[PDB]
Symmetry: C5
Subunit: 314 residues, 5 copies
C-alpha cells in the first residue's frame, strides 16, 4: 500500500509538540505504507544462544553484527533489539529504523517451574538520550504475558510506557503472548489471540504482535486471525510465519495473514537471521515485497530466489 502523512491517524495521547515527530516515526517504521515489516533481533536474551549457533544455523549468525548487516543491506521497516545491543553497533549502522525492545527475559525458567515475567530493563530516558545522541530510534517494544501470575506487573509497566512513548512521539509495538499455568493448552486458541489483540488497543499500542491462532474445524488459521485483527481496532496487528517451513510456504502464510487475516504486517526473526547474509537479505526483500509493495506469493518467491530484485525507491 501507500499512505501520506495526512493519512496517519495521530492518537490523542500524542501531545501537540510531538505530533510531527510521531508522524515522522510512523512513516519511517511503516516505510510510508502503513504496514509494519518488523525484523526481530531480540532473541539473544529470549532463547540465549539457541537461535544463533547450532545445527541448521549458518555460521555467520554466531556473530551479532550479522543482524545489523541484514538490517542495513536487506529491506525492513524496523529492527527491534535491546537498548545495549543497538548501542554497540548503531554508530556503524545509522540508516536503520530502530525499535528498542524495553523488556527481556531468558527461557531458563520454564512455565511449569514459575509463570513468565519479563521486566523493563531501563527507563525511557535512557532511550531518549540515545536518540538525542544520533541514534534513529523510531519506537519502543514491550512483551506482556497475559494470564501469568505476574500479569499485573507487566500491565502496569506496559501502560505507563505507551503513555511516555506517545508523549515523545515514539511508536509502540506490544508483543502479547498469553502464557502461564492459567493458559496452558489455550495458548494459541482463536479467542486467546483475539483477547491479546484487544488488550493492546486498550493499552494504546500502535501495533500488536501475536502468535497465529490454530486452525479450527470452522476456520483456517488466517480466518481466525481476522477476528483478532478486528478486535485490535485502530491498533495494527502483526503476526509470524512458521520458522520450520519452506520459503514459499512461509511467504504464503504471510500473504494469507494480510489479505484474509487482516494483519497490518509481520514480525520475522530467526527465519531470517539463521540464513547466510545473502539469503537472509533476499528473504527480507521477499517479505517486504508482500508486506509493503503488495506482491503476490509468486513474485515474492522470485525475489527470494534472486530472479528479481526489490528496492523501496522502486
Amino acid at each position: 500500500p501507500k499512505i501520506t502523512r495526512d493519512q496517519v491517524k495521530v492518537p490523542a495521547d500524542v501531545l501537540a509538540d510531538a505530533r510531527e515527530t510521531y508522524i515522522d516515526n510512523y512513516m519511517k517504521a511503516t516505510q510510508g505504507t502503513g504496514r509494519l515489516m518488523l525484523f526481530a533481533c531480540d532473541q539473544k536474551v529470549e532463547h540465549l544462544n539457541g537461535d544463533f549457533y547450532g545445527e541448521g544455523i549458518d555460521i555467520s549468525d554466531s556473530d551479532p553484527e550479522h543482524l545489523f548487516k541484514i538490517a542495513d543491506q536487506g529491506v525492513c521497516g524496523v529492527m527491534a533489539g535491546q537498548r545495549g545491543l543497538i548501542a554497540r553497533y548503531a554508530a556503524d549502522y545509522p540508516n536503520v529504523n530502530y525499535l528498542v525492545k524495553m523488556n527481556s527475559k531468558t527461557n531458563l525458567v520454564k512455565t511449569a517451574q514459575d509463570d513468565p515475567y519479563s521486566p523493563q530493563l531501563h527507563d525511557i530516558e535512557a532511550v531518549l538520550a540515545m536518540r538525542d545522541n544520533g541514534v534513529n530510534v523510531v519506537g519502543l517494544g514491550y512483551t506482556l504475558y497475559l494470564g501469568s501470575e505476574y500479569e499485573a506487573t507487566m500491565l502496569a509497566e506496559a501502560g505507563q510506557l505507551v503513555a511516555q512513548a506517545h508523549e515523545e512521539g515514539l511508536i509502540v509495538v506490544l508483543w502479547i503472548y498469553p502464557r502461564g499455568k492459567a493458559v496452558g493448552k489455550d495458548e494459541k486458541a482463536p479467542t486467546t489471540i483475539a483477547g491479546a489483540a484487544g488488550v493492546a488497543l486498550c493499552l494504546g499500542a500502535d501495533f500488536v504482535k501475536v502468535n497465529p491462532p490454530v486452525a479450527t474445524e470452522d476456520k483456517t488459521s488466517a480466518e481466525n486471525l481476522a477476528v483478532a485483527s478486528a478486535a485490535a481496532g485502530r491498533t495494527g496487528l502483526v503476526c509470524a510465519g512458521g520458522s520450520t517451513v519452506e520459503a514459499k510456504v512461509f511467504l504464503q502464510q504471510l500473504h494469507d495473514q494480510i489479505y484474509i487475516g487482516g494483519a497490518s504486517g509481520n514480525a520475522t526473526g530467526r527465519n531470517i537471521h539463521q540464513r547466510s547474509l545473502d539469503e537472509a537479505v533476499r528473504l527480507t526483500k521477499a517479505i517486504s515485497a508482500i508486506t509493503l509493495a503488495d506482491y503476490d506469493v509468486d513474485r515474492a518467491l522470485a525475489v527470494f530466489n534472486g530472479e528479481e530484485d526489490f528496492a523501496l525507491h522502486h
Copy 2:
C-alpha cells in the same frame, strides 16, 4: 431530575483552584441531573474478547469503534474505558464525557488459582496530559477487590488516586467488588454490598459501583440495596441490571434500584454493546430516560422499542 451548579456538594479535598472544574465535570457526568448513567467500555481487558464476539453477540461489536458510535449517537452520562482505548478514538469522537478506567486485569487467572488484583495502568499525569491535549476527560475509575489477599495494594492505589483526582477537579467512580478466597459465597450478600459502599465513601469517591445484592426472606434485592445506598452516605451508589433478562425486566430493575434501592444511577456494559448499533443506541436512550428524566418503565420501554425518541431536557 435537575440540579443547579449551587446544588453540587464540593468535597473538602477539591481545592479552591479546582472547584469550578469539579462542578463542570460533575454537571457533565450527571448531565445536570445529579444522576450518573455510566456506559462501561472497559471489558475488552476484563473479559478479553468474550463480551465482544461469539454466539448471541451482534457482529458489529467485534469492532471497538462500535462503542464510540454508541456513546456518540446514544444518550449517556459518561463513557468509561482504558486510557489507551480512549486515546485511539477520542479525536474523532470529541463530544463524549470520558471516564478513564485507571486499572484493568484479564479473567485468565481464576480466584481459585490466585486472589484477584487489578493494577493501576499508568500515573494520573498521563490522563492530565491527554485532557490538556483536548480530550473531554471528566473523571477517573478504579476497581477494588475487597477481601482479596491483594486488597492492600488496591486500597493504597485507590486512596491516593481519589486525592490526586480531586486535586485536579476530576470526579471518581470506584467499582468495589469484594472477591477472593475469603469472600466466596458472600459476594452478593446484602452485608457485603453495604460494606463495599461504605468503603468507597471513606476513600472519598463521588460514586460507587456495586453488584445488586441478592434478595433475602425479609427484603427484595432493591430493598437490600437501600441499606447500601445509606452506608455510602454522600457517595452516590450506582448499580447494574441483569445482562441476561428481558429488556422490560432490565428497565424495571433499574427503576427499582433508584426509587426503592436509593441508587444515584447505573453502570451498563455488555447489555448495550452486544446489540446492533441502532438497538444499542435505543437502549442507552431508554436507560437515560429513567435515570436522567424520571420516565416510567412503560414509557422507557417505548423508547427501547423505537416507538418514541429520547433526547436531553436541559443542557449544562
Copy 3:
C-alpha cells in the same frame, strides 16, 4: 485536668517553624487538658457495615452523617476518620478537631488465612492540602499489627509518617494491636500490651491506642495497664472500655484505666455511634467529663442519664 501552652512538651522532631502549630494542635486535641478523648469513626472500613447496621444498633447509625452530628453536638477531643470520609462532610462540620486515619483494612481476610496488613491509603501531602483548604486537621492516626508477617511494612510506614507529621506540627496517634500467627493466644497479655506501648514511643508517637490487658491472678486489667503506661514514657497511652457492657460499668472501666492504669485518655467508637443521636451525645459528654474534667463515675453517670448537662467552657 488543665494545662497551659507552656506545659506542652514539644518533642525534638517538631521543627522550629512548626512549634506553635504543634502546640495549637496539642491544645485542641486535648482540649487544653493534656488528656485525649478520641471518638473513633474509622470502622466503616475496618468492620465494613457490621458496626453500623443490624440488631442492637440504632437506625440512625446506618447514615454516616450521624458520626459528624455526634462529633459536632457532643463533646470530643478529636474525631478520627479516613481522609475521604472527612472530605465529604467537613465543610458542613468545620468546628471539629479532625484526626486523619492514614491506613485502613477490611476484616474479610482473617488472621488464620493470612496475617494482617493495613496500608497507608495516600501520602501526607493529600492531608496537608485538605488542611490548607480549611479543614481543621490536628493530627494523624496509623495502625500497626506487631507480630504480623507484614510487620516490617507497617513499621517503615509508621516511622516515616511520625517524622513527616511532626515536621508539619501535627500530632500522631498510633493504634498498636499485636496480631498474627505469632501472637494469637497472647493478644491481650500484659506483656504484649506493654510491648506495644513501648514501641509507639520508639516510633515517636504523641499517643498510643492499645487494647486493655487481661486480668491476671496477681493484678486487675487496670493494674496491668499501669505497666504499659510506664513503658510508653512520654507517649500518652489511651485505651478502650468494654463494647458490650452497661454504661456505668463502661465509665468505671475508663476511670480505672486513667487513675489506676495511668492512661492519658481513651478511644471510643461503636459504643457511642450505635446509640441514637441524643444518647450518643450524652455518652460523649459523660466520657469527656471523666477524661477532661475529672468527674467521678457517679457524676459522669448523671451526665449520661441527662440529670446534668456538660460543656467545656463551663
Copy 4:
C-alpha cells in the same frame, strides 16, 4: 588510648564539605580515644518490654527516662536509640552523643516461623532535620541479618545508608547478626563472626557490632575474635560481654575482647539498664575506664564499686 583530629582516617566517601563534621563526630563518638563505648538503648522494639520489666530487672528500668539519665549521668561514647525515642527526650538531655538506630523489628516472629527482617524506619532526612533542630546526632546505626532470606533488602538499605551518612559526615555503626534458616547452629562460629566483620568493611561502616564467637578446642572466644577484628580491617569491631552476669566476669570479658580479641570497643545494653540508676552509672564508668582509658580489670572493678571515680577530664 588517645587520638588527635589528624589521626582520624577520613574515608573517601566523606565529601570535602563534610570532612570536619566527620572528624567532629568521630572524636565525639570515641571521646577522642579512637575506641567506641556504645550504650545500646534500642531494645524496646527488639525484645518489646522483656528487657525492661520483670524478674531480676530493677523497677527503675520500667520508665524509659532511665535510659537517658544513665546516658547523661554516666560515661558513654554514644547512646544508640530509635529516632522517636530520642525525639521525646533529647531536649532535656542535650549533652549526649546520639546514634540514631535506623531500623528495628520486634521478636514476636521467631526464626522458625520466618527469617528475620528489620526495616529502615524512615529516611535519613528525618534525622538530619532533627540534627538541625539542635539534637547532637553524631551518627547512625543499622542491623543486618546475613543469611536471612531477606538479606538482600537489608544489604541494599545498609549500603545506601552508609553512603548518605558519610556524605553528611555522620559515623555509621552496623549491627551484623547472621541469622536465619541457613545459619542456625553456625550463628556464633568463629568463621561466621569474621564473615560478618568483613562485610561491614565492604559496606563502608566505621564500626561493626557482632556477637562474640564461641570458644573452640584450639582457641578461646577472645582468641577467635582476633580473626574477626583482622577481617574488619579499618572498620572498628565492637563486641559484647555476657548478658547480666557478674560485673567482674563481664569486665574481664570486655578486657579480653580488646587486648586479645582486637576489639575497638564495646556495645552494652541490658547489663547496664537493668540495674538501678546509681549502679548502672557506675557500670558505664567502669566499662568506659577499660574502653577509653585502658584500665585493667581490678581498677575498673574499683570504679564499679565506687571506690574510685572516673571522668573524661
Copy 5:
C-alpha cells in the same frame, strides 16, 4: 597489544560530553592495550571470610589492606571491589584504576534453599560523589544470575546501570553466572556460557565475565569458549583460570582463553590474594605479561618465579 584512543569503539549510549572520559577510562582499564586484566577483590562478601583465612591461605590475606598493597605493587588493569571497601583505603592508594562492584550477596543461603539474588547496594550517585572526591573510579561491576527465580530483578538493575554508567563515561563489567534450580548441572555447559555472554552484549556491557565452559568430546574448554566470545560480539569476554592448579597450568589456561578462546582478558581473585604479598605481586605481573604484553607461557612463568621482573611497556594513557 597496544591500541590508540582513536581505536576505542565508543558505544552510542556514551553521550557527547562523556566521550573523552569514556575513552580515558577504557584506556586506563585496559592499560592502553584493549585487554582487561581484572583483579577481583569482592569476595569478602561473596564467600565471607572463606577466601581470606584458613588452611593454604597466607596469613597476610587476613588483613584487607593486603588487597590494596597487591593492586599497588603488582601490575593490574583494574581492581574490582565494593564501594565501602574502596572508600576505606583509596586515599592511601590513589594510583589504582578502581572498578566499583555495585552488587553483592553472601553464600550462606544455598541454591537448594532459594535461588540467588545479589542486590544493588547503593545508587550510582554514591560512586559519582566518590569519583568527584578524588577516587580514580574507571568503571562499575554487576553480577547477574540468569535462570534464577530472581533473574528479573537483576536484569532490571543491570540494564539501568549500564545506561547510567555510560551516561557518565564509566566502563561496565558484568559478571554473568547462570545459577539456580533451573540451571543446575548446566552451569558450565558451552551453550550456557555462550548464552550468558550474549546477554551482556544486549544489556550493553563493555566486558562480560563468565566461567570457563567444560570440555566436550568435540572441543576443548578454550575451543568452546570461542563460541561465547563470538556471541558477545563487541562486548569483550573475560574468563578465569582454575584456582587450584599449578601456576604453569593456570597461565596456560589464560593463554589458551585469549588466543584460542577469543577472550579480551581475565578476572582473577583468590588465586592472587591467598598468596604472600611478594608472590601475589609476582603472579599479577605474570598474568599481566600474558594479557597486556603478549608473553609466552614460559616467559610469564619466569616472571612468576622471580627470574625476571615485569613492568608496563606503554603509558600513553598517562
